[PDB]
PDB file of C-alpha atoms (C1' of nucleotides) in Angstrom:
ATOM      1  CA  UNK A   1      -2.178  18.715  -6.546  1.00 28.81           C
ATOM      2  CA  UNK A   2      -1.276  16.934  -9.682  1.00 28.04           C
ATOM      3  CA  UNK A   3       1.793  16.536 -11.373  1.00 26.64           C
ATOM      4  CA  UNK A   4       2.971  18.149 -14.770  1.00 27.88           C
ATOM      5  CA  UNK A   5       2.275  16.455 -18.173  1.00 26.77           C
ATOM      6  CA  UNK A   6       6.047  16.786 -18.793  1.00 24.54           C
ATOM      7  CA  UNK A   7       6.692  15.206 -15.808  1.00 22.23           C
ATOM      8  CA  UNK A   8       4.282  12.495 -15.947  1.00 23.58           C
ATOM      9  CA  UNK A   9       5.450  11.343 -19.293  1.00 26.41           C
ATOM     10  CA  UNK A  10       9.106  10.665 -17.999  1.00 24.53           C
ATOM     11  CA  UNK A  11       7.556   8.688 -15.209  1.00 18.81           C
ATOM     12  CA  UNK A  12       5.432   6.231 -17.477  1.00 18.72           C
ATOM     13  CA  UNK A  13       8.596   6.221 -19.697  1.00 17.88           C
ATOM     14  CA  UNK A  14      10.791   4.801 -16.827  1.00 16.03           C
ATOM     15  CA  UNK A  15       8.175   2.304 -15.381  1.00 19.07           C
ATOM     16  CA  UNK A  16       7.984   0.413 -18.661  1.00 17.62           C
ATOM     17  CA  UNK A  17      11.473   0.303 -18.615  1.00 18.50           C
ATOM     18  CA  UNK A  18      12.284  -0.181 -15.014  1.00 19.17           C
ATOM     19  CA  UNK A  19       8.988  -0.408 -13.036  1.00 22.26           C
ATOM     20  CA  UNK A  20      11.024  -1.335  -9.790  1.00 21.27           C
ATOM     21  CA  UNK A  21      13.602   1.509  -8.329  1.00 19.52           C
ATOM     22  CA  UNK A  22      15.854   1.216  -5.696  1.00 16.30           C
ATOM     23  CA  UNK A  23      16.395   4.532  -3.335  1.00 16.79           C
ATOM     24  CA  UNK A  24      19.336   5.432  -5.784  1.00 18.05           C
ATOM     25  CA  UNK A  25      17.335   4.859  -8.997  1.00 17.02           C
ATOM     26  CA  UNK A  26      14.320   7.017  -7.478  1.00 16.21           C
ATOM     27  CA  UNK A  27      16.712   9.917  -6.005  1.00 16.00           C
ATOM     28  CA  UNK A  28      18.282  10.675  -9.587  1.00 14.03           C
ATOM     29  CA  UNK A  29      14.871  10.959 -11.326  1.00 15.70           C
ATOM     30  CA  UNK A  30      13.541  13.516  -9.052  1.00 17.97           C
ATOM     31  CA  UNK A  31      16.721  15.745  -9.493  1.00 16.67           C
ATOM     32  CA  UNK A  32      16.204  15.294 -12.992  1.00 17.98           C
ATOM     33  CA  UNK A  33      12.116  16.728 -12.837  1.00 17.67           C
ATOM     34  CA  UNK A  34      12.164  18.728  -9.974  1.00 18.41           C
ATOM     35  CA  UNK A  35       9.966  16.559  -7.508  1.00 19.71           C
ATOM     36  CA  UNK A  36      10.157  14.848  -4.159  1.00 22.41           C
ATOM     37  CA  UNK A  37      11.395  11.521  -3.919  1.00 23.87           C
ATOM     38  CA  UNK A  38       9.135  10.091  -1.603  1.00 22.27           C
ATOM     39  CA  UNK A  39       6.434  11.735  -3.748  1.00 22.15           C
ATOM     40  CA  UNK A  40       8.520   9.451  -6.525  1.00 22.48           C
ATOM     41  CA  UNK A  41       8.400   6.649  -4.060  1.00 19.76           C
ATOM     42  CA  UNK A  42       4.480   6.882  -3.453  1.00 17.22           C
ATOM     43  CA  UNK A  43       3.498   7.205  -7.322  1.00 14.15           C
ATOM     44  CA  UNK A  44       5.701   3.855  -8.138  1.00 15.02           C
ATOM     45  CA  UNK A  45       3.662   2.069  -5.594  1.00 13.35           C
ATOM     46  CA  UNK A  46       0.441   3.427  -6.907  1.00 12.10           C
ATOM     47  CA  UNK A  47       1.398   2.677 -10.676  1.00 11.99           C
ATOM     48  CA  UNK A  48       1.768  -0.891  -9.429  1.00 11.12           C
ATOM     49  CA  UNK A  49      -1.755  -0.848  -7.835  1.00 13.03           C
ATOM     50  CA  UNK A  50      -3.103   0.632 -10.878  1.00 11.26           C
ATOM     51  CA  UNK A  51      -1.523  -2.275 -13.016  1.00 12.04           C
ATOM     52  CA  UNK A  52      -3.041  -4.639 -10.547  1.00 12.55           C
ATOM     53  CA  UNK A  53      -6.428  -3.363 -10.389  1.00 14.55           C
ATOM     54  CA  UNK A  54      -6.774  -2.745 -14.234  1.00 13.65           C
ATOM     55  CA  UNK A  55      -5.342  -6.063 -15.329  1.00 16.16           C
ATOM     56  CA  UNK A  56      -8.385  -7.511 -13.296  1.00 15.78           C
ATOM     57  CA  UNK A  57     -10.887  -5.091 -14.187  1.00 15.83           C
ATOM     58  CA  UNK A  58     -10.513  -5.788 -18.030  1.00 17.90           C
ATOM     59  CA  UNK A  59     -10.132  -9.131 -17.464  1.00 14.60           C
ATOM     60  CA  UNK A  60     -13.629  -9.631 -15.534  1.00 13.18           C
ATOM     61  CA  UNK A  61     -15.451  -7.115 -17.568  1.00 12.77           C
ATOM     62  CA  UNK A  62     -14.011  -9.410 -20.249  1.00 12.73           C
ATOM     63  CA  UNK A  63     -14.780 -13.178 -19.254  1.00 11.79           C
ATOM     64  CA  UNK A  64     -18.025 -12.083 -18.056  1.00 15.75           C
ATOM     65  CA  UNK A  65     -18.735 -11.010 -21.738  1.00 12.88           C
ATOM     66  CA  UNK A  66     -16.806 -13.984 -23.241  1.00 14.98           C
ATOM     67  CA  UNK A  67     -18.279 -16.509 -20.768  1.00 14.52           C
ATOM     68  CA  UNK A  68     -21.446 -14.932 -21.727  1.00 12.72           C
ATOM     69  CA  UNK A  69     -20.984 -15.355 -25.559  1.00 14.70           C
ATOM     70  CA  UNK A  70     -19.983 -18.916 -25.425  1.00 17.47           C
ATOM     71  CA  UNK A  71     -23.330 -19.943 -23.471  1.00 13.67           C
ATOM     72  CA  UNK A  72     -25.501 -18.621 -26.240  1.00 14.47           C
ATOM     73  CA  UNK A  73     -23.355 -20.452 -28.782  1.00 18.66           C
ATOM     74  CA  UNK A  74     -23.940 -23.618 -26.702  1.00 15.78           C
ATOM     75  CA  UNK A  75     -27.817 -23.186 -26.743  1.00 13.81           C
ATOM     76  CA  UNK A  76     -27.885 -22.624 -30.300  1.00 10.10           C
ATOM     77  CA  UNK A  77     -26.304 -26.094 -30.582  1.00  7.33           C
ATOM     78  CA  UNK A  78     -28.489 -27.808 -28.331  1.00 10.35           C
TER      79      UNK A  78
ATOM     80  CA  UNK B   1      -1.814  12.423   7.747  1.00 11.97           C
ATOM     81  CA  UNK B   2      -4.743  11.471  10.328  1.00 16.52           C
ATOM     82  CA  UNK B   3      -6.255   8.053  10.234  1.00 15.43           C
ATOM     83  CA  UNK B   4      -9.691   7.388  11.993  1.00 15.26           C
ATOM     84  CA  UNK B   5     -10.372   6.340  15.471  1.00 12.19           C
ATOM     85  CA  UNK B   6     -11.278   2.718  16.070  1.00 11.38           C
ATOM     86  CA  UNK B   7     -14.546   4.095  17.488  1.00 12.33           C
ATOM     87  CA  UNK B   8     -15.137   5.588  14.252  1.00 13.85           C
ATOM     88  CA  UNK B   9     -14.276   2.612  12.236  1.00 12.74           C
ATOM     89  CA  UNK B  10     -16.042   0.223  14.321  1.00 13.85           C
ATOM     90  CA  UNK B  11     -19.158   1.885  14.287  1.00 12.28           C
ATOM     91  CA  UNK B  12     -18.260   2.312  10.326  1.00 13.28           C
ATOM     92  CA  UNK B  13     -17.780  -1.391   9.942  1.00 12.60           C
ATOM     93  CA  UNK B  14     -21.173  -2.036  12.022  1.00 12.05           C
ATOM     94  CA  UNK B  15     -23.029   0.506  10.078  1.00 10.03           C
ATOM     95  CA  UNK B  16     -21.685  -0.533   6.703  1.00 15.56           C
ATOM     96  CA  UNK B  17     -23.441  -3.657   7.195  1.00 19.22           C
ATOM     97  CA  UNK B  18     -26.848  -1.952   7.283  1.00 18.91           C
ATOM     98  CA  UNK B  19     -26.627   0.669   4.363  1.00 17.32           C
ATOM     99  CA  UNK B  20     -23.806   0.103   2.377  1.00 15.95           C
ATOM    100  CA  UNK B  21     -25.271   3.262   0.557  1.00 13.42           C
ATOM    101  CA  UNK B  22     -26.395   5.748   2.498  1.00 13.73           C
ATOM    102  CA  UNK B  23     -28.250   9.216   1.779  1.00 15.90           C
ATOM    103  CA  UNK B  24     -27.345  12.613   2.716  1.00 18.02           C
ATOM    104  CA  UNK B  25     -30.016  12.534   5.573  1.00 18.60           C
ATOM    105  CA  UNK B  26     -28.318   9.385   7.200  1.00 15.89           C
ATOM    106  CA  UNK B  27     -24.818  10.660   6.191  1.00 21.42           C
ATOM    107  CA  UNK B  28     -25.718  13.932   7.975  1.00 23.37           C
ATOM    108  CA  UNK B  29     -26.192  12.352  11.397  1.00 21.94           C
ATOM    109  CA  UNK B  30     -23.446   9.960  11.272  1.00 20.44           C
ATOM    110  CA  UNK B  31     -21.192  12.401  10.199  1.00 17.65           C
ATOM    111  CA  UNK B  32     -22.480  14.445  13.178  1.00 18.67           C
ATOM    112  CA  UNK B  33     -23.085  11.251  15.320  1.00 18.01           C
ATOM    113  CA  UNK B  34     -19.617  10.388  14.890  1.00 18.13           C
ATOM    114  CA  UNK B  35     -17.318  13.835  15.043  1.00 18.43           C
ATOM    115  CA  UNK B  36     -16.677  13.908  11.160  1.00 20.03           C
ATOM    116  CA  UNK B  37     -16.466  15.897   8.413  1.00 19.84           C
ATOM    117  CA  UNK B  38     -19.368  14.276   6.092  1.00 19.81           C
ATOM    118  CA  UNK B  39     -17.154  14.463   3.066  1.00 21.54           C
ATOM    119  CA  UNK B  40     -15.086  12.097   4.859  1.00 22.70           C
ATOM    120  CA  UNK B  41     -18.065  10.436   5.607  1.00 21.51           C
ATOM    121  CA  UNK B  42     -19.325  10.400   2.196  1.00 22.27           C
ATOM    122  CA  UNK B  43     -15.773   9.285   0.943  1.00 24.41           C
ATOM    123  CA  UNK B  44     -14.733   6.400   3.152  1.00 23.52           C
ATOM    124  CA  UNK B  45     -17.953   4.826   1.839  1.00 21.51           C
ATOM    125  CA  UNK B  46     -17.184   5.474  -2.010  1.00 19.83           C
ATOM    126  CA  UNK B  47     -13.591   3.648  -1.350  1.00 19.56           C
ATOM    127  CA  UNK B  48     -15.397   1.052   0.965  1.00 19.53           C
ATOM    128  CA  UNK B  49     -17.912   0.492  -1.730  1.00 21.52           C
ATOM    129  CA  UNK B  50     -15.286   0.202  -4.266  1.00 19.32           C
ATOM    130  CA  UNK B  51     -12.852  -2.235  -2.346  1.00 22.46           C
ATOM    131  CA  UNK B  52     -15.615  -4.776  -2.113  1.00 19.85           C
ATOM    132  CA  UNK B  53     -16.757  -4.731  -5.981  1.00 21.59           C
ATOM    133  CA  UNK B  54     -13.043  -5.480  -6.713  1.00 27.98           C
ATOM    134  CA  UNK B  55     -12.702  -8.212  -3.748  1.00 28.71           C
ATOM    135  CA  UNK B  56     -15.851  -9.534  -4.957  1.00 29.58           C
ATOM    136  CA  UNK B  57     -14.879  -9.735  -8.474  1.00 33.82           C
ATOM    137  CA  UNK B  58     -11.543 -11.214  -7.229  1.00 32.08           C
ATOM    138  CA  UNK B  59     -13.114 -14.210  -5.552  1.00 33.13           C
ATOM    139  CA  UNK B  60     -15.496 -14.221  -8.746  1.00 33.26           C
ATOM    140  CA  UNK B  61     -12.178 -14.137 -10.710  1.00 29.06           C
ATOM    141  CA  UNK B  62     -10.141 -16.910  -8.750  1.00 30.08           C
ATOM    142  CA  UNK B  63     -13.574 -19.086  -8.921  1.00 29.71           C
ATOM    143  CA  UNK B  64     -14.115 -18.690 -12.536  1.00 27.72           C
ATOM    144  CA  UNK B  65     -10.221 -19.180 -12.906  1.00 29.98           C
ATOM    145  CA  UNK B  66      -9.945 -22.646 -11.186  1.00 29.83           C
ATOM    146  CA  UNK B  67     -12.783 -24.060 -12.224  1.00 30.45           C
ATOM    147  CA  UNK B  68     -12.130 -23.816 -16.095  1.00 30.43           C
ATOM    148  CA  UNK B  69      -8.571 -25.008 -15.227  1.00 35.06           C
ATOM    149  CA  UNK B  70      -9.311 -28.015 -13.680  1.00 38.81           C
ATOM    150  CA  UNK B  71     -11.707 -29.345 -16.227  1.00 42.77           C
ATOM    151  CA  UNK B  72      -9.182 -29.729 -18.881  1.00 44.96           C
TER     152      UNK B  72
ATOM    153  C1'  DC C   1      -8.288   7.332 -10.397  1.00 45.54           C
ATOM    154  C1'  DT C   2      -5.173  10.380  -8.173  1.00 46.60           C
ATOM    155  C1'  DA C   3      -1.635  11.932  -4.560  1.00 48.34           C
ATOM    156  C1'  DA C   4      -0.474  10.808  -0.273  1.00 53.74           C
ATOM    157  C1'  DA C   5       0.802   8.319   3.156  1.00 52.65           C
ATOM    158  C1'  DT C   6       0.639   4.246   7.125  1.00 52.83           C
ATOM    159  C1'  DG C   7       1.079  -0.799   8.920  1.00 54.44           C
ATOM    160  C1'  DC C   8       3.328  -4.807   8.833  1.00 51.48           C
ATOM    161  C1'  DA C   9       5.725  -7.983   7.979  1.00 48.76           C
ATOM    162  C1'  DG C  10      10.150  -9.621   6.059  1.00 47.53           C
ATOM    163  C1'  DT C  11      15.674  -8.801   4.569  1.00 45.40           C
ATOM    164  C1'  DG C  12      20.477  -7.556   4.399  1.00 45.64           C
ATOM    165  C1'  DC C  13      24.425  -5.661   7.260  1.00 44.52           C
ATOM    166  C1'  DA C  14      27.172  -3.586  11.113  1.00 46.49           C
ATOM    167  C1'  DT C  15      27.489  -2.907  15.985  1.00 44.48           C
ATOM    168  C1'  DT C  16      26.238  -4.172  21.161  1.00 40.52           C
ATOM    169  C1'  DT C  17      25.807  -6.892  24.692  1.00 40.47           C
ATOM    170  C1'  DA C  18      26.087 -11.115  26.860  1.00 41.19           C
TER     171       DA C  18
ATOM    172  C1'  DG D   1      38.018 -14.942  21.657  1.00 36.82           C
ATOM    173  C1'  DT D   2      32.386 -16.237  19.642  1.00 37.05           C
ATOM    174  C1'  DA D   3      26.938 -16.386  19.355  1.00 40.76           C
ATOM    175  C1'  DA D   4      23.021 -14.135  20.243  1.00 36.61           C
ATOM    176  C1'  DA D   5      20.740  -9.558  20.669  1.00 36.11           C
ATOM    177  C1'  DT D   6      19.266  -5.146  19.224  1.00 33.29           C
ATOM    178  C1'  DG D   7      19.320  -0.838  16.653  1.00 33.58           C
ATOM    179  C1'  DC D   8      18.958   0.937  11.692  1.00 33.02           C
ATOM    180  C1'  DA D   9      17.622   1.285   7.827  1.00 34.65           C
ATOM    181  C1'  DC D  10      15.322  -0.582   3.457  1.00 36.11           C
ATOM    182  C1'  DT D  11      12.187  -3.623   0.727  1.00 39.03           C
ATOM    183  C1'  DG D  12       7.436  -4.626  -0.751  1.00 38.67           C
ATOM    184  C1'  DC D  13       2.781  -4.876  -0.581  1.00 37.27           C
ATOM    185  C1'  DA D  14      -2.219  -4.109   0.841  1.00 36.97           C
ATOM    186  C1'  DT D  15      -4.828  -0.408   2.874  1.00 41.36           C
ATOM    187  C1'  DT D  16      -6.421   3.636   4.042  1.00 41.69           C
ATOM    188  C1'  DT D  17      -7.555   8.804   3.730  1.00 41.68           C
ATOM    189  C1'  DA D  18      -8.730  13.414   0.489  1.00 40.43           C
TER     190       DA D  18
END
DNA sequence: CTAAATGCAGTGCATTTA
DNA sequence: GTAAATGCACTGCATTTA
């Protein structure tokens, strides 16, 4: 119900390299690490949602704090 | 797999307006009231919940984004 | 967050049908 | 003979279900 660490390493290793596979690209990976490609297909989409979601989350949790800290500076000036 | 009936989801969208964080008791009736496994019921809300914070902060994002840039 | 999966456009090319 | 259709894949993403 989850994937192998041996496996998942090579997943993330490829996505930094080639974050968008063709079918052909997808198939060969599976044969290398004993998985189904539609699985492989699915993951590659979900990793893409991951980067979208986190790039937003970090930013929001950050800018809220950054726009918060700057405001305190403005009042110390006034 | 198997998605959820429109009857289900419509009642969902209708109730989600009311108590977007519902307790076991009400979860228990709704689960029964709507031919559901309450885990499923418990689940969908968690996601339904999770979606909105993301959707809201994205608008929080885009609105805080255009304001800062346009000033320059 | 994961793992699995669906729904809807849209895109390209090869083959029918009109 | 040609142009428009249709059948078949694939892509890509956002959303849903557990």
